[PDB]
Amino acid sequence: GTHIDLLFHPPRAHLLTIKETIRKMIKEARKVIALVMDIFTDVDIFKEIVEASTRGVSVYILLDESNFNHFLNMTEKQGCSVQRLRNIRVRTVKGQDYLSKTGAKFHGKMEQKFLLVDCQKVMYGSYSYMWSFEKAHLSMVQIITGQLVESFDEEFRTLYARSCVPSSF
Amino acid sequence: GTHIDLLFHPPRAHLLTIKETIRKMIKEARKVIALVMDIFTDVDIFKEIVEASTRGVSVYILLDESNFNHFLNMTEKQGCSVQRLRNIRVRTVKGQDYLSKTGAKFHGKMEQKFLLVDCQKVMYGSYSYMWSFEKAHLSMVQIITGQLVESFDEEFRTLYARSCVPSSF
Ligand SMILES: C[C@H](O)CNCc1ccc2c(c1)OCO2
Ligand SMILES: C[C@H](O)CNCc1ccc2c(c1)OCO2
């Protein structure tokens, strides 16, 4: 009782692109959108999320900490003050703490990406929400429904508990 | 008829780490190993692969073209001329051709990471075979059996047809 379809970019034998499928999933949202992403600079996908929040959908976004200022800079160039949108909460996640060869203290990255809508459908895979994934790279995603979606819901809650308010805010 | 389990790094409730489960998957190979990977510098996983080859398992490895020299540098430090192992074939895959605003043509990257053993079991996810995924980063994989494995076999064959002999070789 889990069903899975594969999609690719550039696209193969499927009618929609990965980016067009992400837009559809967000337009179809009725209650909640949960997103985990490493880099998010795509203006078209951002515009779909803001529209959903204006309809009354609760939006929770978890971003890799090292790359967060790329997202904030895009939203400001769009004229948007994302801080002011009450139906959206944006928080950052760090990787492990570690010591380098020279003894300095750094943290790694959250290498995770997925989109979870209404606790019933997930898109999971290697596509990041930036221009390079449209024009330069090969990538793939799964569209997932059924019992496995509950395991993504539990992982989202665990990451939300770990996450912090962004330091730039 | 597809079963999927999740594993994390750092580990959550499961006994084995992601790296221990990769080693297990390789040791259990009877006929064929098929690997697609973006960066491969982990000496311990490479030793498992070479040992499988010596017992007569056929090994096919597809690496991101722009990161190939990191693999070659590792195999040379270990004192192994990998190009002399007849049961291993290593080939590279490029991203899309694109033209920058200064006119120069470039290519992007293959962002895809999976291990397929005996056409029957896959590990798919965000874990790359390098020291930073052990010590620094947060990552996750799926362990997949059943009908979905066929779709990973088809994608492997399609990348294998695209791939080239590395230019050093
Ligand atoms: C005013 C009306 O009620 C809603 N406007 C439709 C609409 C406009 C812009 C959009 C969108 C949808 O999705 C992404 O950007
Ligand atoms: C009997 C002979 O030495 C080979 N089998 C033992 C063994 C040695 C080295 C290995 C390994 C297994 O797996 C990975 O590295």
Swiss-Prot record, chains A, B:
<comment type="subunit">
    <text>Interacts with EGFR; positively regulates EGFR inducing its autophosphorylation in absence of stimulation by EGF. Interacts with RAF1; displaces 14-3-3 proteins from RAF1 and activates RAF1 within the RAS/MAPK signaling cascade. Interacts with AKT1, PIK3CA and PIK3R1; activates the PI3K/AKT signaling cascade. Directly interacts (via DUF1669) with casein kinase isoforms CSNK1A1, CSNK1A1L, CSNK1D and CSNK1E.</text>
</comment>
<comment type="similarity">
    <text>Belongs to the FAM83 family.</text>
</comment>
<protein>
    <recommendedName>
        <fullName>Protein FAM83B</fullName>
    </recommendedName>
</protein>
<comment type="function">
    <text>Probable proto-oncogene that functions in the epidermal growth factor receptor/EGFR signaling pathway. Activates both the EGFR itself and downstream RAS/MAPK and PI3K/AKT/TOR signaling cascades.</text>
</comment>
